[PDB]
C-alpha cells in the first residue's frame, strides 16, 4: 500500500516538433489564419535552411505613416526626378521622419538593430524563421531611403546609409519581394565606390558566409571579381596566388564537412576569371574527383549530389 502510494505519486496512464512549432506559433507577428500545415512544413525541413535566413525587418511596418509619405512623394511642387542635392525635398520628409533611423523604424526595423547595423552570428540572427511581418513595397522603401542620401555630408552619415542599404537588400523578405530590375539598387550602388561598398559589405557580414555572398552576386553579379579580390586578396594571401587560396578554402571546407557552405562557395566562385567554365580546367576536374570520392549514393547529404550536378554542368559550359 505504501509502495503504491509512492507509485500513485508517479504519473500513470509523438511530440517530434511540438515545442518548435509552438514557439514559432507564439512569435508569429501575423493577424490571420496561420494554418497548422504551414507550421508543420516550416518546422520539419531537416535537410535545407530555406526557412532560416537573415531578416533585417522584424516588426510590422507603420502602414499609415508610410502611406502618408507616399502620398506626399507622389504629388509635390517640383514633380521632377529627385536630384542628389537641394535637400531631397526635405520640407515634408524632415517633418515626417527627421532622421534615417525614424524611417527604418517606420519600415519595421527595431531600434536596437538600427543602433548596430551588423549581423550577429553568435545570436544566430543570420538563421531565423520568417517573422511573417507585413512590409511596404521595396521600390517605395528604396525611394524613401534615397531621400536620405545627403551626399554633401560627413562620412559617418554616408557610411550609416550604405550599411543600412546593404542590410536592407540582404533581407530575405526584401530579396524575395525585390523587383526583377534593380534600377534603384543599381543607382544606390553607383552612388558609392565599388571598393568602399565591398569593404562595408564585408564589415557587415562574415567572410566565410558564402550564402550571403551568393545572394549579393545574384543582386549584383558585376561585383563578383571585386568580392573575390576582397576575400582572396593577393597581398593578404602572402606569396600564394588567388587560385591557391581558393583551393585551400575548398580543402578546409571539404575537411570540415561544411557541405552547405561548400556548395554556396562553389556557386560564388564559378563564373570569374580565376575559376572559369570549361572542360579543360584542372580545378573543376579536382573538385569533381573529390566529390566523386566522398559521394557514396547510399547514405549521403543532398549537398554532395547537388555539388556533383552543379560541377558537371559548369564543366560542360564552354
Amino acid at each position: 500500500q505504501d509502495l503504491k502510494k509512492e507509485i500513485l505519486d508517479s504519473p500513470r496512464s509523438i511530440t517530434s516538433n511540438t515545442v518548435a512549432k509552438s514557439e514559432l506559433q507564439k512569435s508569429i507577428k501575423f493577424s490571420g489564419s496561420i494554418p497548422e500545415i504551414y507550421l508543420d512544413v516550416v518546422t520539419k525541413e531537416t535537410i535545407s535552411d530555406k526557412y532560416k535566413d537573415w531578416h533585417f525587418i522584424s516588426k510590422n511596418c507603420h502602414y499609415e505613416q508610410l502611406m502618408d509619405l507616399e502620398m506626399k512623394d507622389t504629388a509635390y511642387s517640383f514633380l521632377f526626378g529627385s536630384s542628389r542635392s537641394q535637400g531631397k525635398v526635405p520640407e515634408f520628409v524632415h517633418l515626417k521622419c527627421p532622421s534615417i533611423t525614424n524611417l527604418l523604424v517606420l519600415f519595421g526595423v527595431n531600434q536596437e538593430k538600427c543602433n548596430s547595423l551588423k549581423i550577429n552570428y553568435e545570436k544566430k540572427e543570420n538563421s531565423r524563421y520568417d517573422n511573417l511581418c507585413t512590409i511596404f513595397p521595396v521600390n517605395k522603401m528604396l525611394k524613401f531611403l534615397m531621400y536620405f542620401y545627403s551626399d554633401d555630408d560627413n562620412d559617418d552619415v554616408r557610411e550609416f546609409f550604405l550599411k543600412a542599404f546593404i542590410c536592407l537588400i540582404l533581407d530575405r523578405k526584401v530579396f524575395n519581394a525585390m523587383e526583377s530590375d534593380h534600377r534603384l539598387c543599381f543607382k544606390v550602388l553607383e552612388l558609392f565606390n565599388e571598393a568602399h561598398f565591398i569593404n562595408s559589405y564585408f564589415e557587415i557580414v562574415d567572410k566565410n558566409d558564402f550564402f550571403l555572398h551568393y545572394r549579393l552576386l545574384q543582386i549584383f553579379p558585376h561585383l563578383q571579381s571585386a568580392l573575390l579580390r576582397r576575400r582572396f586578396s593577393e597581398k593578404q594571401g602572402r606569396t600564394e596566388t588567388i587560385q591557391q587560396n581558393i583551393i585551400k578554402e575548398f580543402n578546409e571546407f571539404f575537411d570540415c564537412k561544411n557541405y552547405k557552405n561548400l556548395l554556396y562557395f562553389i556557386l560564388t566562385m564559378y563564373g570569374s576569371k580565376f575559376i572559369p567554365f570549361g572542360p579543360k580546367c584542372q580545378v573543376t576536374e579536382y573538385f569533381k574527383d573529390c566529390i566523386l570520392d566522398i559521394s557514396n549514393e547510399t547514405t549521403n547529404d543532398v549537398e554532395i549530389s547537388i555539388l556533383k550536378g552543379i560541377l558537371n554542368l559548369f564543366s560542360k559550359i564552354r
Partner: protein
Amino acid sequence: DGALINSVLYVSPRNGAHYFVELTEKHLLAFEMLNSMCLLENYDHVLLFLECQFGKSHNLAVIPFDIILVLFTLSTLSEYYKEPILRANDPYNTSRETLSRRALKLLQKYLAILKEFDSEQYNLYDLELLRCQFFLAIDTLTPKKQKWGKTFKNPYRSYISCLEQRNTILGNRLLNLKLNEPGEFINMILWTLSNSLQESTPLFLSSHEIWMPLLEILIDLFSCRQDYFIQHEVAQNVSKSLFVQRLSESPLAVFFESLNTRNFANRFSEYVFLNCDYKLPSDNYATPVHPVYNGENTIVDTYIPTIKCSPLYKSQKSLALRRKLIGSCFKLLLRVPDGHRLITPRIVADDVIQGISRTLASFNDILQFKKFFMTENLSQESYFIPLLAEGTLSEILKDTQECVVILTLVENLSDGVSFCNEVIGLVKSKCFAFTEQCSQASYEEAVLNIEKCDVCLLVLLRYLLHLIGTEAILDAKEQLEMLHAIEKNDSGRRQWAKALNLGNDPPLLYPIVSQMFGVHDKSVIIE
C-alpha cells in the same frame, strides 16, 4: 533609330523570319545543354546556367526561344497557389527564390539588355541572336482571333527542341499554347487590369506578382517587333495603299485585333480603365473574367501572404500599365497615313482620343487622374499624352461651360507665344475659371472638374517647356500677360474661397506654375 532596329549584319533572312540568325558551335552547344536540362525537368539547373554567366563576362549567353517560352510558363507558376508543386520539384531551394521569380527576373534582365544594344559591353552577333530568339518567341505568341466569350515549329534544324514532345511544364500548359486560344489573350488582359486595383489578396497577388510584369514584357517586345517590322518588312517607298495593308499585318495590328470587339473606341476605353474610379456610362455590359491557370484566385494553405501594398502604389502601377497599353495603341495608330484607315483593325485615332477623354473626364478621384497624367519621362510618352490632355480639357470645358472654345494647344506647343495667347483667351472666356453657374450644393463636383482641368493645363505647360525651354518667360510680354491672367484666375477662385461655402481651399495652380516657370510668383515672392 537605335542599333536594336538597325542591326542586320549577321542576320540570315528566311521565308518564316527576316531576323533569323545562324547558330555558332558554342551557341549550339549551349542551346543543346539548355534543352537537355529542360527535358529532365531540371529547371533549377537551367536558371543556374543562365544566372552563373550573367554579367560576369564580355560574351553573352543567348536564351533559346523555346527556353524563353519555358521561362514565360514558369513565371505563371507563382508560389501563392503552386507552393507544394514547386517544393516537390525543388526540395532543396539552394537559390532561396521561387522558380517563377527567378524566371521573371531573368526575362526582365534579358529584355533590358535587348532594349539597349551595347556593342562595347556585348558582341553584336550575340545581341542579334538574342533579338532573333525574342522575336521568334513573340511570333509564337501571336494572339488568336478575338472571341467575346501548328503545334510547334523549330527554325533551327541543328538541335531538337524540348517543347516538341511536351505541352506542359509543371501541370500548367505552355503560355504560347494558352494565349493562342480565341478567348484567352483579351481575357488575360482584362483579368490583370481588373485585379490590378482589386483589394482581394488572391486576385491582387495573381496580377501584381505574375500578369503585370509579363504583360509589360510582352508590350515592350511587341513594340520592338513593330519597330523592326516598320524598319525592314515594309517596302520603303510605297503608293500609301500597300503600306496600310502591311500595317494591317503588323504585330501591333494583330495584338489589337484580339481587342477589336464591336466598337473599338468605347469597348477599348472601358477595357483599359476597367474597375477604375470613373462611373460606368450607359450601363455597359459587365466583362466576364476568369483565372487563366486553374486556381489563380485561390491561395494555398502553406503560403502565407506577408506583403501589404498601399492603394497609391497599386494605382500607380495600374495607371502605368494602362499608359503603356494606350501608348502602344497610339504608336500603332500614328503610322497610319492621313485619310486612309486600317482594314483588319477598325481603329480611328480621333475615336480613341474621344473615348479616353470621356473616361478621364468621368473620373471622380483626382489621385488616379494625376497618376495617369504624371510621367517620369516626358519624351517617352510625348506622342499621345498631350493629345489625351487636350481632349480631356476640351470635354471638361464643354460640360462645365455652354460655350466650347476650340483648343489648338497641341499645334501651339511649337510657339510659346501662341500657347500663352490661347491660354489668355481661354481664361478671359472664364471657361478655365470657376463657373458661377454651378450651385453651392454641387461645389465639390465643380472643384473636382476644375482640378482635373488644371492637371490637363499643367501637363500641356510641361510639354511646352519640354519643347521650348525657359528663354522668354518675362522677356516676351505675352508670357508675362499669361502669368498675370493666371493670377487673375487665382483671384477669381479666391472670390469663391472668400464666399466660405466650404473650409477646403479651392485648388490653385499658381504655386505649381511658379515652381515650373512662374519665376517664384513673378515679383510676388521673388524677394
